[PDB]
Design a protein around this ligand. Structure first.
Ligand code: MG
Ligand code: ZN
Ligand code: ZN
Ligand code: ZN
Ligand code: ZN
Ligand code: ZN
Lengths: 576, 525, 49, 44, 93, 98, 82, 67, 115, 257, 87
RNA sequence: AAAGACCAGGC
DNA sequence: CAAGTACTTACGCCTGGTCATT
């Protein structure tokens, strides 16, 4: 009927007006390219040779456009249409058309997209304004899109069959709008949390952790190779931190060149012991923590997520605030290029050797698990003889479940601590956990020590069968194996009951992921549609569509959230 | 023991499963009788006397690996993986590529991928013997290196050896079938398979018709490119209107088999199969048997690939960062078992709950062959020649190619077709359609404060339109532009008319409202 | 005659029942092909439980 | 125009608009007998 | 804090707790065309038709629907040519 | 034609009542891989609507042990509702209880 | 409002800069005279940015205060953020 | 389907070593000994012969299109 | 479908040049050699040979993009010794070394076979 | 400021393997020689296939690719065969290609194995490594396979069919003395074939004044170029590339200066 | 195109008065026939009224010069025998 | 060929 | 003025095949 056409999604108002299908847009699978700058998008020659941008044939570029016309549509750096002033369009694809190639001022030539053209790159679950960023086209062979890895985080991307959308602005005005508003370097720091969105992620972060130790000394040739990749290098080779015996540079010394300008920063590495700041060696750091960057030189410290990542006060954040968007873009690209080309020498891996511990630690983990099992058996026996008083606020059964969960979680925590403390300083799992590139302590604990309690609906594996979790158990077996504790670690392999319990836990997670999406998306739409038209007027008062004063000053102070940062009052706390 | 003895002689003894069941040995238990059944997972550990847990077992399980279904039994060492990775593999195995049926030559089916050189896994599960996975493999064993070589494998991507793909690695054929049916619909309206001449059919397309034979069908072997005509066909209009079948855009295949028959109604019926050899490029998708999925980031040549002291350059390099968070360990143990099996010469066992295949046992067996017990190998950089200071974990892992190829996903749009109703770009890649600028995109752009780009996307890029609106009443006015006689019936106005540029979608919205008696007046004063 | 019931492939009523591998290959059917699908208007249809 | 029968494989010369019928085989499926024009396969 | 502040204000500004839902986003004194994009469409348009409600086209969804430059950033100001500054300086063409 | 239509279109019932009829039964056997053919021939479909937000009907019940694969289930909004048989599972064909 | 009593931000906002650059670039592409000397640049956006830095754009931004009054600010008066 | 000539990882011809592999396995030897007797020292080459499936025998059972 | 032809890494098409020399203005007597249709095989050996020269203060090479086929070699020498001279001398030295190695290997094969 | 003086000794020289050690040379030059082994050594490989009849179960592109990977003995005529890109004639000529013909129809009940012995060439020197036989296809009764091919000269950069070598085993510093790879636990790594250390000790002591030299090789042919020819032609090609680069650089310097 | 290009500053909704509907309608007497076409050609007063819009993808309508792109589609009207509620 | 429904799938 | 009822809404994008009706 007439009403069903004008309805919600797939209707008219939302399916054809507030959102509509657009021209000059392409899509293909994205694929990593660490060589491309942060503000570049790798575009195949087919997408470029199809998408066209109209350029007014000014007398400055009548020659270049005439050559593009002469190329035709076959040659890639060519053109498809000539739009003469009266609106008539002459098509270059069909026949050479030798009398229609004439160009004068005021005509338009629909040239194929070339390197440097500003495009808007989109990942369809567009949640924040850092999800549609302006890139610069670079044409690369093969038929995939290619974007830098630090741009993976803002898009929430991952190159596993992922696809992105490439919108090409067509007028000069919209090109300038995207260039001055939504380029990647300008959107390093989001106003959502006054933190950077893009950080050194994945391989380059792990190699930065390995490259910024006191261990790493670089010879002359490796220094030359690394310094070739700095786009911001002034051409001066720094004097090595080690001279006569054999000129050897240091990883931090080369990283000092990457750091833009005169940036000051103080951070703490992940493995920074708590007592160093209070004890001596506060400024000496035996473990080489406490990153201190002074005058743009990395004086000391191991760089990890806590300094080169998307946290407040990170070195990338300080770079954006102090230096600017252009220099910070150069910083990102240089870090990636130089650190990847050093990682070619150093290398990184993961394997079975990193998921196996010493026999002593296996013994300690097994003993802790058995002690926890004996404790839970004792608690079951105590509850069966009615020697357990009901904790205030909980019934007896909930008190027993809390006791069992406490014992098993304490066991998992202690076993994981033992496994973590048993990792070799060369361990790849530990390298990635300390680097923060990909991993967590619980992941090491599960792959080495114990997988842990498996929970469904927040409680232990529920009694699906009649008073028994599986047919293989006796009724009313509340012991750790029966109700969901997976004693075996991932490497040790899980017994069938533990396998089914892990299937139940993982399935719970999957169901949550697949069922929360509708509610979250609907909530986002309601939020946007509630305040879509609310803006800061030129009198610095925040007003809605009916000029109703919402906030007298935006955010009660009148300052945008990209520039603010955390500071300490230094007068609120101290005594009189 | 007698039952197993007669089953080992299953041939020439006429002892089957039904004899085993009829002898009172095995019993079917349904779900609600399983409640009143106490089950022993394995005999050798539960029946025997120990510190007793249950002394009243009523049934025992044949092997606990039968809980897993058909697609999840191909997972090697699935008990070591995180369960969501097993689910991802279960989904991915159906999308793997291989010989789907041994008589694909006769069946003319749409979207038929046939892999070139399938290999049966070197780390196999016993269940795979009954799924016939050995007889129709979907995948191939690749010398997988877990290394971070040049950053083109970061996130989930992989680095595929160009030389391997050069020698036939993962190469596949994509058979696509096109079906056309002659029919008699009207009295004088007749469809017929015949080659259209240049001037006999009123409807024509810029395609090339020279490949069609006298019958209107291309003979096999003809190298048909995109837009080329496959089955010549035209309808006698009440002189003729062509209705021949073109190819999909950017295919560039070769005809395999062209078939003529009669359909149910007795008309002439044609089915044409075109094969396109799809060499693995750097947009294609590859997945392990453990949920480790990724696009081929880049295709380095053999010299560029790192090499062992022996000369084994990895065919696929996967990211070390993929593993630790998702805790896929069947991949690592499967690489170890693949190395030990390829060296030893047998096909290793990856049955889930075996308790006689430990990591340490595989490691010792690997150390017995001159390799590192953990599977590591000292690797040399192919560019500079230097040893890589960190030893790379190299092992033969079963990787399977997926149906998701980039040449079946890449689309570009620049002023193509429009829908009949909305006058906006069509929906889809096949209809030369355009990407959608949904509501979330416009919310993002508003957040940017980008009014002009938003207007271009939602006005100029899509349907642009011009209407004439009366000034006295906002109802659109009759506008004869060539005669320049702009008249608004309803107030007899002929002079006070203004031109409004609005999207055609908004014009349709206003007219649809007018057909519901609502008058959306567009007043410009 | 009152109708035509579709016959599941490799059912007791299919013409492929009880045939050896050589016979099926003479009929251009794959011996490994499980069966269990109907053929309706040329397409293969599987009835989900 | 010669078509190869799908069962007996004996090539039959079937004219246009004639019913698709294999002589001496009684089979209604026929095939097409690849063209004599020759295309080049780069062995890459 | 400013994002939470703006949400909490856009609720508790009109004097009553305004839920971020069809009852409160479509209850305010906005235009029919802004309400018509959020969960009611034909109902809002019918009400506006009945009571002769007028949309002044001040919001963003309104101008997006008509394909006009919405008063967002790069839309909240109008540029004008400056005649005096065209003479001053060098001008080649 | 009733049997043919119901098997072909997938809407289980009379043609005139397509909207009220069950859909998604009698799918097309996907023949990309042999494992896909087998998984399609051995598949179970919970008739509950895929748009339900209740987690319980999608969770892996304990009673699926040995009857339904604990792992194989399509991601997305059809998770836990389209299931696949375990290797040993057999579905009773029927017997008159005389 | 009049030329006097301009109560607004002396700084040029990012949206104002974006739109002034776009409009000036289109004017330059449409054979408009270029106020600053050009060192052989043929990109209208690049010429526009050169003019903006030199503060020689013939554009007055009309900022509409919410009460309906407008303030006209020449591009040369505003201080560029970059 | 057919034996892959030119082992992927390195390049050694393993396309003439399949019939000999089958004969050797059929006669006496274990798989490892048969692979050694064919001079496939590197395990990448061994993965070709060892893990191959000779589907061309299944394909050849079907009657040809033309006789 | 957007595959570069396989002969796009060594074959020079019509118009582009094998070698180009550009002076780097930041630092004195330091030039930049862009070699087209060449890869690490030549760049690494050139860099290593250059680093043998005592009068070379900086010598490095890089491939700007693996999908592209181009080498950039930066050569900075001591004054009174040009980077062009360093490049040509290093190439001649590599030529001489390869000639010596080929003669020695021919001696080795003649000695090994029936010797 | 001059070149080093490499000394080569050959340990093993068989019909399919040369195992040689090159001393007093840098690491980059050894690696470059190794890469020219794989990449830049010319060879004759089938790169044009025209199929008149193919009734095999393997389709035309399949058999074309199988033909391409068939090694063809290009021991002698490769140096005297000009590239098709650089030849005067269009298509193919006897100085730019070698013509092969295959024509096998299976009439017997037992399967007919179409193998490399059925590739009939015209140049007696280029024979598909048949002084077993590489299997092309298998045919049943009535199936037919006839094709005409031209083999060109190329190297491994263009395609791996021209790659002359199976595994080129390159190794230096077998007893880890330059610490170029820090073994995490030294004791558990197998000693190299060229290890010169005692069993009890794990790695050689660190040599801070050292640099890589004495690079060990194992050049394994694919039956096309004998290993000595592979290595000699590799040094020849590398020297030719550097000579051409020097010619271009001298031309550029003269043009600019 | 002689009319000025004027942007919309206000949308005033309202209910189409019957007199407004009859005057704006390009069909005289109302649509009185159910047949879309009668002889293979659009029938005046049918649902496919040639005056109501531009059809056949090349032609031009009666009301203006259609071209199928210029013509916005002109409204018709049906005179109900007895009035009826608007749902 | 067209839009309608369904199905399967990708992120 | 309570107790009763009915109505409207429930992520974004993208890919393919199938079928009935026109
Ligand atoms: Mg993803
Ligand atoms: Zn009017
Ligand atoms: Zn016949
Ligand atoms: Zn090999
Ligand atoms: Zn020639
Ligand atoms: Zn009209």
């Amino acid at each position: 009927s007439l009403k069903q056409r004008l309805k919600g999604k797939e209707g008219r108002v939302r399916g054809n007006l507030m959102g509509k299908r657009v021209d000059f847009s392409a899509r293909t699978v994205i694929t990593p390219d660490p060589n491309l700058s942060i503000d570049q998008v790798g575009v195949p020659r087919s997408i470029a040779a199809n998408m066209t941008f109209a350029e007014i044939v000014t007398p400055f570029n009548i020659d270049r456009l005439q050559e593009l016309v002469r190329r035709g549509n076959s040659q890639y750096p060519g053109a498809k249409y000539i739009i003469r002033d009266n609106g008539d369009r002459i098509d270059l694809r069909f026949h050479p058309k030798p009398s229609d190639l004439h160009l004068q001022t005021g005509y338009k030539v629909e040239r194929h997209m070339c390197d440097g053209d500003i495009v808007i790159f989109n990942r369809q679950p567009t949640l924040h304004k850092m999800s549609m960023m302006g890139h610069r086209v670079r044409i690369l062979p093969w038929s995939t899109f290619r974007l830098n890895l630090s741009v993976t985080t803002p898009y929430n991307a991952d190159f596993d069959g992922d696809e992105m959308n490439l919108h090409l602005p067509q007028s000069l005005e919209t090109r300038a709008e995207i260039q001055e508003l939504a380029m990647v370097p300008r959107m390093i720091v989001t106003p959502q949390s006054n933190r950077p969105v893009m950080g050194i992620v994945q391989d380059t972060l792990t190699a930065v952790r390995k490259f910024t130790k006191r261990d790493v000394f670089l010879e002359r040739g490796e220094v030359m190779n690394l310094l070739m990749f700095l786009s911001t290098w002034d051409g001066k080779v720094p004097q090595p931190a080690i001279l006569k015996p054999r000129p050897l540079w240091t990883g931090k010394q080369i990283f000092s060149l990457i750091i833009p300008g005169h940036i000051n920063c103080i951070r703490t590495h992940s493995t920074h012991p708590d007592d160093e700041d209070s004890g001596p060696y506060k400024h000496i750091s035996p473990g080489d923590t406490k990153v201190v960057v002074e005058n743009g030189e990395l004086i000391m410290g191991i760089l990890c997520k806590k300094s080169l990542g998307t946290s407040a006060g990170s070195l990338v954040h300080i770079s954006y605030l102090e230096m600017g968007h252009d220099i910070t873009r150069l910083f990102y690209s240089n870090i990636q290029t130089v650190i990847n080309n050093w990682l070619l020498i150093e290398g990184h891996t993961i394997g079975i050797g990193d998921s196996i511990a010493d026999s002593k630690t296996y013994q300690d983990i097994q003993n802790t698990i058995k002690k926890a099992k004996q404790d839970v058996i004792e608690v079951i026996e105590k509850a069966h003889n009615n020697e357990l008083e009901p904790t205030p606020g909980n019934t007896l059964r909930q008190t027993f479940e809390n006791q069992v969960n406490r014992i098993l979680n304490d066991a998992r925590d202690k076993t994981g601590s033992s496994a973590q403390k048993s990792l070799s300083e060369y361990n790849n799992f530990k390298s990635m956990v300390v680097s923060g590139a990909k991993g967590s302590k619980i992941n090491i604990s599960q792959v080495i020590a114990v997988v842990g309690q498996q929970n469904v609906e927040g409680k232990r594996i529920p009694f699906g069968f009649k008073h028994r979790t599986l047919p293989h158990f006796i009724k009313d077996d509340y012991g750790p194996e029966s109700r969901g504790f997976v004693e075996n670690s991932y490497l040790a392999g899980l017994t069938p009951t533990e396998f089914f319990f892990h299937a139940m836990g993982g399935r719970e997670g999957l169901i949550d992921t697949a069922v929360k999406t509708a509610e979250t998306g609907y909530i986002q739409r309601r939020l946007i549609k509630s305040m879509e038209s609310v803006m800061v007027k030129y009198d610095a008062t925040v007003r809605n569509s009916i000029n109703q004063v919402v906030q007298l000053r935006y955010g009660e102070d009148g300052l945008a959230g990209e520039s603010v940062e955390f500071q300490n009052l230094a007068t609120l706390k101290p005594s009189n | 023991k007698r039952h197993i003895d007669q089953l080992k002689e299953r041939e020439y003894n006429n002892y089957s499963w039904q004899d085993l069941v009829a002898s009172g040995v095995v019993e079917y238990i349904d779900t609600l009788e399983e409640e009143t059944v106490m089950l022993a997972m394995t005999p050798d550990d539960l029946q025997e006397k120990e510190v007793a847990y249950c002394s009243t077992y009523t049934h025992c399980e044949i092997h606990p690996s039968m809980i897993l279904g058909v697609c999840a039994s191909i997972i090697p060492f699935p008990d070591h993986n995180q369960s969501p990775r097993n689910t991802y593999q279960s989904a991915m195995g159906k999308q793997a590529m291989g010989v789907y049926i041994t008589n694909f030559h006769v069946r003319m089916d749409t979207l038929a991928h046939v892999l070139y050189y399938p290999q049966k896994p070197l780390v196999t599960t016993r269940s795979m013997e009954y799924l016939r996975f050995r007889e129709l493999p979907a995948g191939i064993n690749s010398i997988v290196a877990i290394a971070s070589y040049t950053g083109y494998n970061q996130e989930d991507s992989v680095i595929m050896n160009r030389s391997a793909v050069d020698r036939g690695f993962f190469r596949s054929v994509f058979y696509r079938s096109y079906k056309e049916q002659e029919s008699k619909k009207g009295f004088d309206q007749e469809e017929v398979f015949e080659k259209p001449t240049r001037e006999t059919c009123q409807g024509m397309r810029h395609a090339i018709y020279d490949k069609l034979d006298d019958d209107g069908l291309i003979a096999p072997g003809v190298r048909v490119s995109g837009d080329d005509v496959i089955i010549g066909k035209t309808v006698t209009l009440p002189t003729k209107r062509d209705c021949s079948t073109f190819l999909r855009t950017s295919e560039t295949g070769i005809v395999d088999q062209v078939m003529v028959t009669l359909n149910q109604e007795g008309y002439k019926f044609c089915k044409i199969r075109v094969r396109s050899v799809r060499i693995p490029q750097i947009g294609d998708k590859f997945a392990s048997r453990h949920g480790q999925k990724g696009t081929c980031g880049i295709q380095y040549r053999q010299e560029d690939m790192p090499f062992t002291c022996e000369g084994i350059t990895p065919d696929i390099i996967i990211n070390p960062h993929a593993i630790p968070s998702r805790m896929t360990i069947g991949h690592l143990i499967e690489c170890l078992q693949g190395k030990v099996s390829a060296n030893k010469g047998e096909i290793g066992d990856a049955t889930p709950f075996n308790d006689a295949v430990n990591v340490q046992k595989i490691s010792n067996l690997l150390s017995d062959y001159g390799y590192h017990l953990r599977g590591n190998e000292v690797l040399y950089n192919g560019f500079t020649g230097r040893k890589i200071t960190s030893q790379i974990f190299i092992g033969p892992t079963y990787y399977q190619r997926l149906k998701h190829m980039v040449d079946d996903k890449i689309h570009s749009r620049a002023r193509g077709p429009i829908q009949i109703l909305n006058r906006q770009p069509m929906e889809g890649r096949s209809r030369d359609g355009g990407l959608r600028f949904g509501e979330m995109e416009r919310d993002c752009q508003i957040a940017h404060g980008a009014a002009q780009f938003l207007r271009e996307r939602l006005f100029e890029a899509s349907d642009p339109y011009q209407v004439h609106v009366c000034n006295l009443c906002g109802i659109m006015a009759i506008a004869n532009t060539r005669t320049h006689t702009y008249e608004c019936r309803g107030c007899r106005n002929k002079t006070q008319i203004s031109l409004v540029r609005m999207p055609y979608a908004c014009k349709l919205l206003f007219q649809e409202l007018m057909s519901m008696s609502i008058a959306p007046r567009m007043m410009s004063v | 005659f009152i109708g035509k019931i579709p016959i599941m492939l490799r059912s007791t009523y299919c013409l492929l029942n009880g045939l050896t591998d050589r016979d099926l290959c003479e009929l251009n059917e794959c011996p490994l092909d499980p069966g269990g699908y109907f053929i309706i208007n040329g397409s293969e249809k599987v009835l989900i439980a | 125009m010669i078509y190869i029968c799908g069962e007996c494989h004996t090539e039959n010369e079937i004219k246009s608009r004639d019913p698709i019928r294999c002589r001496e085989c009684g089979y209604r499926i026929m095939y097409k007998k690849r063209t004599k024009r020759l295309v080049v396969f780069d062995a890459r | 804090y400013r994002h939470l502040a703006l949400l909490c204000d856009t609720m508790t500004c009109r004097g009553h707790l305004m839920a971020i839902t069809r009852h409160g986003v479509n209850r305010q004194d906005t235009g029919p065309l802004m309400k018509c994009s959020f969960e009611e469409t034909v109902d809002v348009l019918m009400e506006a038709a009945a009571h002769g409600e007028s949309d002044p086209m001040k919001g963003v969804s309104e101008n997006i629907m008509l394909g006009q430059l919405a008063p967002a950033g790069t839309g909240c100001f109008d540029l004008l040519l400056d005649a005096e500054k065209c003479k001053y300086g060098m001008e080649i063409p | 034609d009733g049997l043919k239509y119901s098997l072909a279109t997938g809407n289980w019932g009379d043609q005139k009542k397509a909207h009220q009829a069950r859909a998604g039964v009698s799918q097309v056997l996907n023949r990309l891989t042999f494992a896909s053919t087998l998984s399609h021939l051995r598949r179970l479909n919970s008739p509950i609507g895929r748009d339900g937000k209740l987690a319980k009907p999608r969770q892996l019940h304990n009673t699926l042990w040995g009857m339904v694969c604990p792992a194989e289930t399509p991601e997305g909004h059809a998770v836990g509702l389209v299931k696949n048989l375990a290797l040993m599972a057999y579905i009773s064909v029927g017997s008159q209880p005389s | 409002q009049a030329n006097q009593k301009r109560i607004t931000t002396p700084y040029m906002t990012k949206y104002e800069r974006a739109r002034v650059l776009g409009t000036r670039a289109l004017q330059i592409a449409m054979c408009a005279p270029v106020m600053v000397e050009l060192e052989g640049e043929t990109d209208p956006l690049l010429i526009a940015m050169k003019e903006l830095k030199a503060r020689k754009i013939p554009i007055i931004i009309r900022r509409y205060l919410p009460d309906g009054s407008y303030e006209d600010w020449g591009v040369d008066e505003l201080i560029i953020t970059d | 389907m057919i034996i892959p000539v030119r082992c992927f990882t390195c390049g050694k011809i393993v396309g003439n070593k399949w019939e000999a592999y089958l004969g050797l396995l059929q006669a006496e030897y274990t798989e490892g000994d048969a692979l050694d007797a064919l001079g496939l020292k590197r395990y990448c080459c061994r993965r070709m012969l060892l893990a191959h499936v000779d589907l061309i025998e299944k394909l050849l059972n079907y009657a040809p299109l033309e006789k | 479908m957007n595959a570069p032809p396989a002969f796009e890494s060594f074959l020079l098409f019509e118009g582009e040049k094998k070698i180009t020399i550009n002076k780097d203005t930041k630092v004195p007597n330091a030039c930049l050699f862009t070699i087209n249709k060449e890869d690490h095989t030549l760049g690494n050996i050139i860099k290593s040979q250059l680093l043998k020269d005592p009068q070379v203060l900086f010598a490095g090479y890089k491939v700007p993009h693996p999908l592209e086929h181009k080498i950039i070699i930066r050569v900075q020498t001591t004054p009174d010794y040009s980077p062009q001279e360093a490049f040509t001398n290093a190439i001649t030295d590599l030529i001489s070394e390869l000639s010596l190695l080929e003669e020695r290997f021919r001696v080795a094969i003649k000695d090994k076979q029936e010797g | 400021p001059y070149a080093n003086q490499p000394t080569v000794r050959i340990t093993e020289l068989t019909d399919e393997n040369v195992k040689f050690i090159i001393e007093n040379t840098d690491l980059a030059v050894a690696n470059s020689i190794r890469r020219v082994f794989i990449a830049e050594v010319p060879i004759i490989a089938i790169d044009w296939v025209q199929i008149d009849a193919n009734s095999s179960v393997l389709h035309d592109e399949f058999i074309a690719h199988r033909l391409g990977l068939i090694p063809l003995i290009s021991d002698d005529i490769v140096d005297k065969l000009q590239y098709s890109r650089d030849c005067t004639c269009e298509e193919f000529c006897p100085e730019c290609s070698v013509e092969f013909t295959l024509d096998v129809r299976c009439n017997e009940d037992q399967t007919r194995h179409v193998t490399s012995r059925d590739l009939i060439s015209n140049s007696p020197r280029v024979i598909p490594v048949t002084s077993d036989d590489i299997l092309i296809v298998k045919l049943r009764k009535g199936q037919e396979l006839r094709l005409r091919a031209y083999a060109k000269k190329g190297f491994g950069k263009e395609h791996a069919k021209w790659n002359p070598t199976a595994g080129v085993a390159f190794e230096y510093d077998p007893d880890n003395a330059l610490r170029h790879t820090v073994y995490p636990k030294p004791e558990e790594w197998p000693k190299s074939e060229y290890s010169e250390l005692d069993e009890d000790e794990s790695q050689a002591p660190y040599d801070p004044n050292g640099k890589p030299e004495r690079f060990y090789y194992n050049v394994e042919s694919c039956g096309s170029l004998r290993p000595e020819t592979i290595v000699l032609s590799a040094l020849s090609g590398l020297k030719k590339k550097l000579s051409d680069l020097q010619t271009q650089l001298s031309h550029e310097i003269q043009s600019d200066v | 195109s002689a009319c000025p290009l004027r942007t919309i500053k206000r949308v005033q909704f309202g209910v189409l008065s019957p007199d407004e509907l009859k005057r704006m309608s390009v069909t005289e007497g109302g649509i009185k026939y159910p047949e879309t076409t009668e002889g293979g050609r659009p029938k005046l007063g049918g649902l496919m009224d040639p005056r109501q819009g531009v059809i056949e993808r090349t032609g031009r309508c009666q009301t203006c010069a259609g071209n199928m792109t210029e013509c916005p589609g002109h409204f018709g009207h049906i005179e109900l025998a007895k009035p009826v509620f608007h749902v």
